[PDB]
């Protein structure tokens, strides 16, 4: 199971904390799952290689300061923009044991 608050609320210009705690997680991914246009990967916290934000968020996406791992797949969406508002979804792909995913909402 993945632990994520259903709703996350960030005021403008704040580092919204996207939570994704698994109960070891090999990799976490976050994406913006909203619609055809709003179907974009946001960041990939791969445990062995680090965070790899996507081209449109390389600056507004960063993981919490050490040491939050293990099993913490949190990523903070700072300087949140009114547009950022939208449902996201974690995928915690726990290995040596399988796969998962959880939705979320951010309401800026």
């Amino acid at each position, epitope marked *: 199971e993945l632990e994520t608050s259903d709703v996350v609320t960030v005021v403008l210009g704040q580092d919204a904390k996207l939570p994704c705690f698994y109960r070891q997680v090999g*990799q976490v*991914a976050w*994406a913006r799952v909203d619609a*055809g246009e709003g*179907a*974009q*990967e946001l*960041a*990939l916290l*791969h445990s062995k*290689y680090g965070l*790899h*934000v*996507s*081209p*449109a*968020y*390389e*600056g*507004r996406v960063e993981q919490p300061p050490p040491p939050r791992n293990p099993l913490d797949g949190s990523v903070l969406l700072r300087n949140a923009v009114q547009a950022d508002e939208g449902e996201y979804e974690c*995928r915690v*792909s726990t290995f040596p044991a399988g*796969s998962f995913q959880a939705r979320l909402r951010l309401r800026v």
Partner: antibody
Amino acid sequence: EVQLQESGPGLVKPSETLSLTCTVSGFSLIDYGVSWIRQPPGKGLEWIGVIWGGGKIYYNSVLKSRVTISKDNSKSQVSLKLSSVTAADTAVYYCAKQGGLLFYAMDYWGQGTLVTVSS
Amino acid sequence: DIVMTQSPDSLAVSLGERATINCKSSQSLLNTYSQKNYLAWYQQKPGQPPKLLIYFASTRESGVPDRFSGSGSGTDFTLTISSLQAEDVAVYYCQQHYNTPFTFGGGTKVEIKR
């Protein structure tokens, strides 16, 4: 060492389903992503979809509703299945490895395969 | 869907001369936060799979000779093969790798005036 081999049926009856396969080798399909591009003979490249190492699949809007990418991390195999293959689906299909984790420029490519929808 | 429009469609240049293959995007390929522009130039020579040349508009890729000096920003970008030695007679495609669905442009076929 990063080698992608694309093998599939070549001649497909109209209204059928192509089913090429891309045997990746030398890179862990668990970490890197592979996408499928096609290039209609004598035309521009087209994107079909990307299967990121975690199994999230992104498809082009146009060929969607008619495509399916999947992989087997175990056998280093990625596969394309396009439904209702029709006149326009004739092309050289390509599988390329995404350059890096969540990087959208396809650094390594496959040689290609001409699927020919025909009667 | 970012629309990438290369221009011109076809280009003829002598061996020594500069080539420029402009490319345009309905959407900017710029991350202000990162100050990176994400546009990649490929090189589909006759009968071969496309080969990336320049990611990040400017950053080339190991092996790509310096003649291929890519540049540009926003929605206006540009490839420049400084001296079009003959082998560089392929079709060059600009791809936006800013987001999905990746989109390539038409391709500017370059040629040589002997």
